[PDB]
Design a protein around this ligand. Structure first.
Ligand SMILES: [Zn+2]
Lengths: 49, 99, 49, 1273, 49, 27, 99, 49, 49
RNA sequence: UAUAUAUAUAUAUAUAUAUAUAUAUAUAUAUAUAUAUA
């Protein structure tokens, strides 16, 4: 059904639509905390070994 | 997988609508003097388990983690092996599988 | 002596009969089918924490 | 249970029957009904002695503190006002006073009393102030007590009777016995304690007794005194007790409600006190549920199809809930608690909040809790003095913060002024919008079509009406001698009567009469001030036509009237469900008082100017609806003034603007008050019926659109808000109807808008409305309120309090109704308990008890004889109430969704078939010659032994008396007829069309010998229908009543052993149920509160079928061929006849005659007749030809697909070949499917596949007989 | 299989092949972008083979 | 509180009743 | 345009009457055992709005002032671009546009 | 499309082509005269391009 | 009837190097937007003037 | 006597909510001091 019943807006511009969609997702340091955790993990692992 | 799927479904511009398919189906002319109506059968088969239509996004999300988990066709959807090709409901199931 | 005792007997004893004079075993049977379908739902759509 | 022992023997039997112990029978049915009508009502209270209550409730003596009434009333300017006690000018309701001193004693019942004849005489004759004040107080106090469908004590008796014994379990695995039990209900204990004050020798004198003429009171001894508020408190307590039992709530919540009522009753003005703290419960529960951390659950996934104008929605799965989706708006605890502190009820809030905190996740329990707590608000129909009501509501004028400067107008055009182009702002937007619509209306040959003209004139006439006296005066004043038809016994104030008088007169002569007084009426409400009904006279209603037409065009061609087409009200159900889903943010808005805020100084002047200018495009000399063009002076140019012609439409505007500027002049004549009629004008728009919704909805949409696109972007601050506020438009973001409106935001990307921006947005909207004097009264609580429907996270919440079990509105001092009407009240009462999802098993038990009491009644001649009668209980089965237990069956196997009428009978018999046949064979000798459906076993005698036929035919009998004719009055009947026809047939072409059609029709029907006497809908009978309606609106004479009782009894006593021909044939079909259908949705997800595994049957029915009406291929038959019809005739009759003719294979000219009989011209008649075909017709469309319809109870379910591809009329491997419909299946199969699905819906439990298995006669024989019957009727 | 039904079956199958669905285009051109962006958002990076 | 008619098992919350009812009751 | 159209309709020998067309259409024989009757589809279209076909006179009047105003076909009176030629209502719509 | 329906559709189209309508003659021969006369009557003379 | 901006610009001319008037940042059309979005087009026109 | 299931109670751990106390920050009110103006 999903394959055969796919439709969109009449005059969609993908670049514009995704521009609005992704706007709130890159407003904070969220992606960077995992980087910091990875570093601490590295130090902890080496020291433990 | 669930996290990605729900997140994915939020941003997409694609929308699903079973109605368009049903109209294409029902507009087929047929005789009323036949004992069996293929139209009714396929319509009955076409409706999912629930009115769910969520498995599609589940398949998309799985690709990002195929190393962890693999989607598989539901075992219950397979046509019964004892049947023969002339058994229409079995035939339709085979068509949906290959699609 | 009581409709209660009769009803309990019907549910318990004639649990799988198909006589038209009895209704309740059939409905209970339908409910059992209802539950089996319910299993088919979540078996391909479980619940996450 | 010693209480069961306390009941008299017949009632004990009835309780056993209701509990399911024994099959019900007419014998015990009468014994119970009879004994209730003979014993004094106080005994019901006496029953309460045998309940060992164990609840922590204390009734403070503070209740019995009657405040003197004399200081609560005064007369000034010769009108009896309310003089509120507190400084609040709204304390205009019934005070808390001791009525005692104003009582005499009755000769029939010496204990109770009524008003002093001396007081009413002096108030009438002497117009003495204190006499009048006492009278007014007595009248309204009695009226407030009368706002019940019947005496509350009877309802309490019902509750005790059903609750006296636990119901027997059925065999169903989901049949949970009741968890709640008596001796734990605070309400009943409260009733006990308070009633202890009203006993002198263990007699329990009722504080009041309701009668057809109001209510009487008991004279207190010298020691005691009765405060009227106590009676009201009892009703609320009884109503709460019933509701709590049916909703099956915890005693703690009921405890809070009791304390709620007690605190209100303790203070003065019980009504006012309740009204002030009304919204406390919904705010505590509905507005704030999931403002915590442990949030989660499952929620519906609803999608709105692309052509959003169509309002089509699709269920497309479920969505997991998580914290990111939890509601964003602030809770409502702080304001509510602050309010409760005023009445020192903070404990209630603490209890509610603590209990609420036990539901962190959205599931059945959470919504069930919400349903129960919200069911605690008082269900009393509040009533106040109409004089105070009219004085308090219409005394308001809107406050405009930036009025249109006088220099913004052009020179006058006789009455109107056009708007200068240089003026901008919202007013300019409003002006252009109306002007554009007026232009479109201007050139439109849709009007001047004689048929359409007939529709408009006919639309103006109804059985009700008003202002006839003003009409007769104004025209008599101008020398116009109107006709009279009094001998034709029809009310003068009926809009029909005045219309007949007007028929002959040239219209322009009547123009002076439009500036005449308009009478008024009041209709009380449950949770707000009473509504207003302001019926214009027929002439005024005619003049205002352009205003309506333009408004309609604005609605139908911009935002598609925002559902104001009202085609089926259920289209708002999926809308609010979608609006409440987690991904969407919704805001509830509504004009504070749209009727009171629309006015001429700002609004109507702009509209009048725009319409008058918008009509300039068009022939200046073109009369409209008999209004000719005229010459008016144009003064736009100070240097070159002149006069020019203007079309009739503009002339209408000229007068219409004059009327609006003058303001409406109402005349109040309230009956509850004493000798205080007067008249005063106001700018308040009439807004008495749906005819006003068009104007307010149009203006509502217009202002909202301008706000979104212009005002807000120019004024708001948040850049993010601007980004999301843009790319938004009303056609896909806003809906409304009258004042009510819904605004929903575009889906914030996987996120929610900051409450900060929301506050900024909501604040600016308030200011925007303040500009032109609209108080917007907005709120944001992540819920859906629209047309009094409530949805939370895609689950509908039935607000049961708005349908109190005991309460009923009565707008007059007298009930003015006859006994048999009570039956229809019962039927309507029961359905609400199905629409709202209550405990279906217990609700059914209570319903039957109500039916039993209603089953019996009598009447007495004004001087002469008495009369009496009562129905066999089988009537109510035919009327649509499932039986609890049939002989040989098991109790509680029939679902509430069982259809009424023949369908319900057929389904019941179909299930009951085999037992009846076998049992009849053993019990009775065989009948003398073979039967089509039965063997020789002769079940019909057995059915007669059960009195089935008696009930079946009794329900068919009419229940309102008929007025009698007269011959000199028939000269007036003809005079009434002639004029009604004259008013209807303004032109001649329509009359020629109808006459030709009728002449051809009867000629064909007889000569072709289809049949004779076929009552075919035709225009010539429309005046006849009007006349009958007009005469029916009158109070019948006693002779008609006596005829009714005699006829009813004879119909009961006449021994008949046959149903209608249709039902006889329907019994020939055998239907069986297979397995359960595949589920619609996940059973975990709640869709309607209370439709949960506890309330199994509703939970089954909804889960299997799904609620969202989703007729993707069926369209539920709304495509009727005749889109345009005149009032009076029934479309459902017309299409039924047409299809019936088509099945009968009538020649085309037969269709031509029928179509021409309702005004269709020959060309369009041929065009319409060609469209008729068995193919494009829908299942229900064709099935209705034999009166097989869909029960109203099903209107909330998605039955389309089931009927389409789940009711097998011919399964190859099961059906006997004898039942093969063959070629006639094109019109046979829908009938069988309808019968099948009706039987499937009848039984309890999950929905199963329905299959025809056998027809005793051949399917051909069935079809042949059906064709015969179709030809006969 | 009676040819009338056989004619019907090939008819309905033909209808499905003619539906102008949007999904195939979305899979080839737009879905990869959505994945590529979201890969930087989920708490767990993609893990493929 | 809530109870199952087949085994008399009693439940504090309805969700527990539902999951039990659907899963625990079926020569 | 309105003034000119009124004048045109005021004086004209031509009379618009669809009775002969429908009479010539409904006389076509077809099986009653089919599920679709294109005759009904046609007659559902061509619905006489009762305005006595103001559009026709409106189009004629527009010619006199073509240098000021132009008549265009309404957007709604188009076949949806999502449909196929086999969708009968779409085909009929396209036919009317061509005519 | 089932041929029976196809046979019907070509039939009705054929019927339309055979209707002896008067309009085409009126357009070519009579309507211009009506315009030519009325052009001297309307308060606004014709304005063409 | 204020027109503060116009006079502000003229005044700022005499004090450039101390205060500089700039076009409002939010007056620009959104970057993701396309030329076909008329409200954005007007913004660009006013911005140019 | 033991095992298993269900219910209730008690203890311990973890999470969430509410209340109270203490500390820190911000706002409002009142008092006192100082400055300035009248
Ligand atoms: Zn159990």
């Amino acid at each position: 059904v999903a394959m055969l019943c796919g439709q969109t807006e009449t005059n969609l511009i993908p670049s514009h639509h995704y521009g609005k969609a992704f706007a709130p997702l890159f407003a904070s340091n969220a992606m960077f905390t995992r980087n910091q955790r990875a570093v601490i993990t590295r130090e902890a692992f080496v020291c433990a070994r | 997988v669930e996290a990605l799927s729900t997140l994915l479904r939020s941003v997409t511009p694609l929308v699903l609508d079973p109605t368009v398919l049903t109209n294409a189906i029902t507009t087929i002319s047929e005789s009323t003097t036949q004992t069996i109506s293929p139209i009714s059968e396929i319509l009955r088969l076409l409706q999912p388990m629930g009115n769910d239509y969520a498995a599609f996004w589940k398949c998309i999300a799985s690709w990002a983690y195929n190393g962890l988990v693999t989607t598989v066709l539901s075992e219950d959807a397979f046509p019964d092996s004892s049947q023969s090709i002339t058994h229409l409901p079995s035939m339709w199931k085979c068509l949906f599988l290959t699609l | 002596s009581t409709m209660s005792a009769l009803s309990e007997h019907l549910r318990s004893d004639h649990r799988d009969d198909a006589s038209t004079l009895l209704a309740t075993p059939m409905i209970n049977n339908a409910i059992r089918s209802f539950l089996t379908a319910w299993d088919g739902i979540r078996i391909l759509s479980p619940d996450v924490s | 249970e010693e209480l069961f022992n306390a009941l008299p023997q017949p009632l004990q039997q009835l309780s056993l029957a209701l509990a399911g112990e024994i099959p019900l029978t007419d014998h015990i049915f009468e014994q119970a009904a009879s004994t209730w009508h003979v014993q004094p009502r106080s005994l019901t209270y006496k029953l309460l002695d045998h309940i060992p209550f164990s609840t922590p409730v204390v009734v403070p003596p503070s209740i019995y503190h009657s405040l003197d009434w004399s200081k609560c009333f005064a007369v000034n300017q010769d009108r009896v006002e309310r003089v509120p006690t507190i400084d609040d000018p709204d304390d205009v309701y019934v005070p808390n006073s001791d009525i005692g001193p104003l009582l005499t004693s009755l000769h029939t019942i010496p204990d109770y009393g009524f008003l002093h004849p001396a007081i009413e005489n002096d108030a009438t004759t002497l117009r003495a102030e204190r006499a009048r004040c006492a009278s007014t107080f007595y009248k309204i106090a009695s009226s407030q007590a009368r706002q019940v469908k019947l005496d509350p004590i009877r309802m309490l008796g019902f509750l005790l009777l059903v609750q006296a014994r636990p119901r027997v379990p059925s065999g169903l695995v989901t049949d949970q016995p009741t968890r709640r039990d008596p001796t734990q209900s605070p309400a009943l204990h409260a009733i006990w304690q308070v009633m202890q004050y009203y006993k002198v020798a263990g007699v329990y004198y009722a504080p009041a007794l309701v009668v057809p003429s109001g209510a009487i009171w008991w004279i207190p001894p010298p020691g005691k005194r009765n405060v009227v508020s106590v009676q009201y408190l009892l009703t609320d307590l009884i109503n709460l007790a019933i509701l709590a039992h049916m909703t099956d709530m915890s005693p703690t919540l009921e405890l809070t409600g009791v304390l709620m009522y007690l605190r209100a009753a303790s203070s003065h003005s019980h009504a006012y006190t309740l009204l002030q703290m009304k919204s406390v419960f919904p705010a505590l529960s509905l507005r704030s549920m999931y403002r915590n951390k442990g949030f989660g659950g499952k929620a519906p996934a609803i999608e709105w199809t692309e052509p959003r104008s169509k309002y089509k929605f699709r269920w497309t799965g479920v969505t997991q809930l998580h914290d990111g989706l939890r509601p964003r708006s602030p809770s409502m605890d702080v304001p509510t608690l602050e309010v409760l502190t005023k009445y020192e009820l903070v404990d209630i809030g603490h209890i509610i909040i603590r209990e609420r905190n036990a539901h962190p996740r959205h599931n059945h329990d959470s919504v069930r809790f919400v349903r129960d707590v919200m069911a605690l608000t008082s269900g009393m129909y509040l009533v106040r003095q109409p004089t105070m009501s009219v004085l308090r509501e219409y005394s308001q004028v809107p406050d405009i913060k930036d009025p249109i400067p006088p220099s913004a107008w052009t020179g006058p055009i006789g009455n109107v002024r056009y708007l200068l182009p240089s003026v901008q702002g919202p007013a300019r937007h409003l002006y252009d919008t109306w002007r554009a619509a007026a232009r479109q209306i201007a050139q439109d040959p849709q009007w001047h079509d004689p048929l359409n003209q007939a529709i408009m004139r006919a639309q103006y006439v109804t059985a009700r009406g008003g202002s006839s006296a003003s009409l007769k005066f104004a025209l008599k004043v101008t020398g116009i001698v109107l006709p009279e038809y009094d001998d034709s016994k029809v009310k003068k104030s009926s809009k029909i009567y005045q219309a007949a008088q007007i028929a002959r007169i040239a219209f322009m002569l009547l123009i002076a009469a439009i500036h005449a007084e308009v009478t008024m009426g009041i209709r009380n409400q449950v949770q707000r001030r009473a509504r207003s009904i302001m019926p214009l006279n027929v002439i005024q209603q005619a003049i205002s036509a352009p205003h309506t037409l333009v408004a309609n065009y604005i609605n139908k061609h911009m935002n598609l009237s925002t559902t104001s087409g009202s085609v089926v009200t259920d289209k708002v159900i999926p809308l609010i469900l979608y609006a409440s889903t987690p991904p969407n943010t919704v805001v509830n808005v509504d004009i504070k008082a749209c009727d009171a805020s629309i006015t001429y100084n700002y609004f109507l002047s702009v509209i009048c100017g725009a319409m008058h200018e918008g009509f300039e495009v068009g022939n200046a000399d073109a009369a409209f609806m008999g209004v000719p063009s005229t010459i008016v002076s144009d003064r736009r140019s100070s240097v070159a003034p002149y006069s020019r012609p203007i079309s009739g439409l503009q002339t209408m505007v000229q007068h219409l603007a004059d009327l609006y500027a003058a303001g409406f002049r109402y005349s109040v004549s309230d009956a509850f008050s004493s000798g205080n009629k007067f008249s005063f004008p106001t700018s308040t728009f009439p807004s008495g019926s749906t005819a006003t919704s068009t104007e307010h909805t149009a203006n509502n949409s217009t202002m909202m659109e301008y706000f979104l696109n212009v005002h807000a972007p120019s004024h708001v601050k948040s850049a993010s808000l601007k980004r999301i506020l843009t790319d938004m438009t009303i056609q896909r973001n806003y809906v409304c109807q009258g004042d009510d409106g819904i605004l929903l935001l575009p889906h914030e990307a996987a996120s929610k808008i900051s409450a900060d921006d929301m506050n900024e947005l909501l604040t600016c909207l308030r200011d925007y409305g303040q500009l032109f004097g609209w108080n917007y009264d907005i709120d944001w609580s992540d819920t859906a309120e629209y047309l009094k429907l409530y949805a939370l996270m895609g689950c509908r919440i039935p607000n049961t309090s708005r349908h109190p079990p005991v309460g009923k509105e009565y707008a007059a001092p007298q009930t003015d109704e006859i006994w048999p009407s009570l039956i229809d009240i019962v039927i309507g009462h029961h359905l609400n308990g199905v629409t709202d999802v209550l405990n279906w098993r217990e609700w059914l038990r209570f319903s039957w008890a109500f039916a039993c009491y209603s089953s019996r009644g009598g009447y007495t001649n004004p001087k002469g004889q008495s009369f009496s009668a009562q129905y066999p209980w089988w009537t109510f089965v035919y009327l649509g109430i499932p039986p609890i237990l049939l002989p040989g069956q098991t109790p509680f196997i029939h679902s509430c969704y069982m259809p009424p009428g023949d369908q319900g009978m057929f389904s019941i018999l179909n299930g009951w078939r085999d037992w009846l046949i076998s049992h009849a064979s053993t019990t009775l000798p065989p009948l003398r010659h073979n039967h089509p459906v039965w063997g020789l076993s002769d079940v019909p005698s057995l059915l007669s032994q059960f009195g089935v036929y008696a009930g079946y035919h009794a329900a068919q009998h009419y229940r309102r008396p008929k007025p009698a004719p007269e011959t000199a009055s028939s000269d007036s009947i003809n005079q009434i007829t002639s004029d009604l026809t004259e008013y209807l047939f303004y032109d001649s072409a329509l009359k020629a069309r109808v006459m030709k059609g009728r002449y051809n029709w009867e000629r064909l029907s007889s000569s072709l010998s289809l049949n004779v006497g076929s009552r075919v809908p035709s225009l010539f009978d429309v005046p006849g229908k009007w006349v009958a309606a007009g005469r029916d609106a009158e109070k019948p004479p006693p002779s008609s009543v006596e005829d009714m009782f005699t006829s009813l009894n004879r119909c009961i006593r006449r021994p008949t052993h046959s149903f209608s021909r249709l039902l006889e044939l329907y019994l020939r079909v055998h239907v069986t149920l297979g397995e359960s259908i595949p589920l619609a949705i996940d059973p975990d997800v709640p869709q309607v509160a209370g439709a949960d595994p506890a309330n199994d049957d509703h939970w089954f029915k909804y889960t299997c079928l799904g609620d969202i009406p989703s007729a993707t291929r069926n369209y539920f038959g709304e495509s009727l061929f005749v889109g345009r019809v005149v009032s009076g005739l029934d479309v459902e009759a017309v299409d039924a006849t047409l299809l019936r003719l088509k099945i009968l294979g009538a020649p085309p000219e037969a269709f031509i005659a029928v179509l021409n009989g309702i005004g269709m011209s020959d060309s369009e008649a041929h065009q319409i007749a060609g469209r008729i075909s068995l193919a494009n017709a829908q299942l229900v469309q064709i099935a209705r030809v034999v009166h097989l319809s869909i029960p109203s109870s099903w209107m909330t379910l998605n039955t389309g697909p089931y009927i389409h591809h789940h009711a097998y009329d011919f399964k190859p491997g099961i059906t006997q070949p004898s039942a093969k419909s063959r070629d006639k299946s094109i019109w046979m199969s829908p009938i069988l499917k309808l019968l099948c699905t009706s039987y499937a819906m009848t039984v309890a439990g999950p929905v199963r596949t329905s299959i025809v298995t056998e027809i005793d006669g051949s399917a051909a024989a069935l079809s042949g007989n059906l064709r015969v019957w179709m030809r006969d009727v | 299989v009676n040819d009338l039904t056989r004619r019907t079956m090939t008819g309905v199958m033909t209808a499905m092949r003619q539906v102008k669905t949007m999904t195939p285009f979305y899979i080839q051109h737009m879905c990869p972008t959505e994945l590529s962006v979201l890969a930087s958002v989920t708490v767990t990076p993609p893990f493929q083979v | 509180s809530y109870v199952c008619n087949v085994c008399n098992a009693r439940f504090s919350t309805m969700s527990a009743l539902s999951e039990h009812l659907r899963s625990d009751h079926r020569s």
